[PDB]
């Protein structure tokens, strides 16, 4: 025998796994134009 | 099986894209007079 | 559906529109001295 | 059978749903300003 | 039944509608002497 | 509705009208030495 | 009912009145020189 | 019969009219200074 | 019964009142050099 | 997808080329006089 | 739309326009006796 | 696996690159007239 | 209300009315040995 | 409205219009001599 | 396009012509007595 | 209560009344030897 | 035994590796027009 | 990639060729008398 | 009880007390050239 | 009987009293330079 | 009793005392140049 | 590691490198005529 | 034990060691031109 | 006997412990970039 | 016996105590470029 | 290109040209008594 | 303890006593020329 | 209050009073020669 | 790399070449009746 | 207090009046020839 | 305690007082010709 | 370590040193023809 | 330390020292025919 | 280094040596007859 | 101190004096042969 959290507690390390790709487009996203946003916003200014 | 986070989080995805049209035209347009108010507003001046 | 941002984010399109007229008449009034003060101020001290 | 979250826990996705028109009315309202604020306050300044 | 965000939460709508005239009377009244500051400054001196 | 830059931002529109009459007399009246200083300075010499 | 920023948000617009008077001695002061400044300074030269 | 949180949890509709008058008078009266100070501060400078 | 935000919350009426007088003189008196510190710097120069 | 910065901020671009030709009469009016002014003021002199 | 800069701006057209009558009359009037102050004053001489 | 900053958060890569050339055709275009501002409206005066 | 450039401004209006007294003497007085200067320096040569 | 270089700039009109009557007595007068040098100090010589 | 200091900056042009005519009846008036000055002066000298 | 600009802004009033001696002593005494130059010396020359 | 925070919590310790060669590319970016904006955008105007 | 002050700041490098035809028409014209103003104003009068 | 930014937000009203002493000798002692800069820099010129 | 929430959790109303004196001594403090901060750091500049 | 927050928060006191040595040094010395920089600077120059 | 705003940071390097070449042509062309603007319309007045 | 800040938060204190020598070569390089702007500019005007 | 929370409760002692090597490391390494960040991020601006 | 707080919670005081040394570095070394920054980056301009 | 002194400064060219033949009759006519006016005077006095 | 500001932020303390040898040189050399250029530039004319 | 250039401007006043009588001894001693040389060098030629 | 002045910035050197053939003429030819015209106007005389 | 332009302004009030010592015998020395410089050079001739 | 802006911003006082002796020799140098000048290039003209 | 103004702020050292050879021969070549013009333009006259 | 105006501003020194011999050669050459014209044009008219 | 006047300004030397030949044979041609004009107009009289 | 126009501006004081001996051979030359050429060029004629 064994305690059994250790193979199917685990899916849940697919559950933050997901998220990288997509999650990070969302801030990749949004941080997109957040960096941009300065420029693209401050330059024309000058 | 997988988590859906990855389709329907993204809807997003298109709250970011859209802006980019009417977003811009803010800025594109209050940085408009933004640059041309520099001239139309300093060449006289001379 | 569609995000409302671009329809109603719009109306600030109207207030950069509205400030040509009068905005204008301020340096178009400001810098209307402004040319004009050179030679009205200078031309008699020839 | 089923579990019925399904059909009946969705009805939220309506609460949702109607905050865009409204919700966004008072962003794209109170944005309104927000952007329009920055010339129709800037531009006389020069 | 239909969610009370819409009607009700509208309230503020009225909360930026009435700034629009004191709101303004301030930039409007402190951009007053902000552009005729420069010229009531100004033109004097030469 | 309408934005309220336009009938109050005006305003200032007198602020250059005023100087005209004291704003001259000031450029008028140093002018007004300024030319006349020639001859009335000028034409004993010869 | 009303929203309570059109009456006592106001009294700023007094506080642009006063300045009028004490607010222009200074420049109606500083640039009272400043005119006078040149031919005072100006016209013994010739 | 009925379920009574309409009538007496709305007293609390009283708790955010009241806040309106000294409410704002706060911001009304912080607020008051905040746009004032500008010209108040700013107008002397020039 | 009322709601007791109104008189005792108003204790910052106060709060805001003081300073005219003290917060003045600090830009009432950093203005104070700083108008006077145009002419007194500048005339002289001439 | 394309950044919207480079159609719409352009606008200014035309900013510019209207002052061309009454930006210029402005000088080549103060201009104007400005060359002229020597002979018609310096010929009759000899 | 267009940009107002070229109906209002030039009113210094007339700024410019108006000093050639009066303009002139001081050096029209200066020089008046300037080449005659040449012969006035040189002729009796020999 | 990767952290995903680095191929999708470099898009503002491209936000950047695209003002060079609108970018600078507005000072390009402003600082265009700018330089020419000096010769076209200074050797006139000589 | 007015704007106050107008009779305070003008102080600056006997700057230029005092100097006519003193002003005066000086190339009242310069001039005064100017054309003297040529006859009581010119006469006794013939 | 209409610019006032012209009522006001005038007053100079009468500062080389004084002139004349005492402007002339100075080579009306050192003039005077001048012609009657040649005579009253040549006729004796033959 | 091209810039407008050819057309409008050449009206001077014409400020230079004018004077030949009259510019030269005061030379060609004040050399018209300057050389038979010496004839009409000198002959009934021998 | 008033707004306390008028009182204590006022003390820069006599910073422009002091420099009238002591500022003018400068040029007063520059301008002293400025006109003075002239004839003491020019005189000699002739 | 030990505690697991230490080899497994670490992983984050790449999270801010990476960034620094996409993330200053931003920065690297942004500020790489920053100063550059400065010369180019400066030194035509002298 | 390349900066582009390079291509597009150059127009102005028409701004100073263009004024050499036109710009010296108002020397070449106000120095065309200029030199000849000392002959036809000069030899008439030996 | 009372609020304490009067008698000890004060001390500042000493922080522009002190520069009028040693803050003047460098306007005192930068001015002090700069006008007499004038007249040892002109006179020996004529 | 009666709560006793009201002599005894009172005491937190010394707990905000106390720090009106040193808790003022702490802006009163740094705001003490702050406001000091602009003269002494900004008047020796010009 | 009594609360700790007078005796200790003070110590910041000092945390505000110390830089008024150093502190100063550096603007005492940044302004050093900076008042001395106009004239050795600017001496010369004439 | 090392960070990176040396290599990278560094574009700039050619952002300043660029404009000597065009950049110098405005002045190395302003300037052009500017020298040879004093000969060309100075020496022909002698 | 120890607190580990110290060792590890320090490694910033290469952050602000690396931009000294690419750092300045901005300032160092835009400053280059900004000083040498100011002759190569300057002293062909002559 | 004893009661044993005392020994073996106490192994989270070393649960806190370990956590300063790797969990400052963390934000050792987090603020490590914060501070950094700041002049990395803010010099190369001015 | 006592409650443990007071001895044991103290270590606390010491984790405040260490980041003066390395924490002052970063400011006193952030700032260290940020007051220098201002000369350094500001004199040669002059 | 070339420099446009050459064919247009040379306008003057016919300046000098045109007197030759009225230039000349009124030495050619002054002269023209001046020789003969001495036999015509002389000879009968025999 | 003490607070470690004034050791550490000194180092700028270096900053502005490096550029007083190159930074001057700078102006040394920049005035070099500007005073010379007066003479060198202005003596053969006479 | 008054302009302080009439009493103070006046010194010159006796700049011009004091070479009457020195002014004088060189005319009146060069043309003491001057009249004294026509016999004192012409009588005794006959 | 070097400093572009010296290519472009001696265009000028032309500038100065041009004007000796035409530039002479006018003097060459001003001056050419200058000399003759002492003789041609003086013995017929004799 | 007072405002110290008065005592320490004032220097410059011996730059002008050691000048006229040193100043005077420049022109004193200069016109010192200048006057004799017509005899010396002039009755030689007789 | 006092304000250190006094001992330490003096320095300065040292910056104005090193000039007078180099930075005479500049104009008393410069003016050392320039009054020699006149005599030197004027005499042996007569 | 040392601050890099030193090195490569001094690049502006070679700005200065090149217009030497450049630079003059503009005012060595206009000042070349200005000594030569009075000559060249003057002796034909006698 | 010192302030180093002195040495290194005092490179003019030699600025001025060098024209004497070849800036006196084009006087002391434009001059050398200046007195050697009156003779050498005039003593053969006798 | 050296400065540059002193080979360069020089060329003027050429431009009064190339004079002596042609411009004495304008007062040599011009004298020539003046002598001659003596005997040739005053020998056949006797 | 003293200002130091004083030793330093007298070196003309030397320029002045250095002429009389060279200064007067050049009239004292010149005319030399004046007064001897009326009777070496006269008494034969007897």
Redesign the interface.
Same mark, same amino acid.
């Given at each position: 025998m064994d305690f059994n959290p250790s193979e199917v507690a685990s899916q849940v390390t697919?559950?933050i796994?997901?998220? #990288? =790709?997509?999650?990070?487009?969302?801030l990749? $996203?949004?941080?997109?134009?957040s #960096? =941009?946003?300065?420029?693209?916003?401050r330059? $024309?200014?000058?």
């Open positions: 697919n559950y796994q997901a998220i #990288a =790709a997509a999650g990070v487009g969302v990749a $996203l949004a941080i997109g134009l #960096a =941009a946003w300065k420029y693209a916003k330059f $024309l200014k000058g």
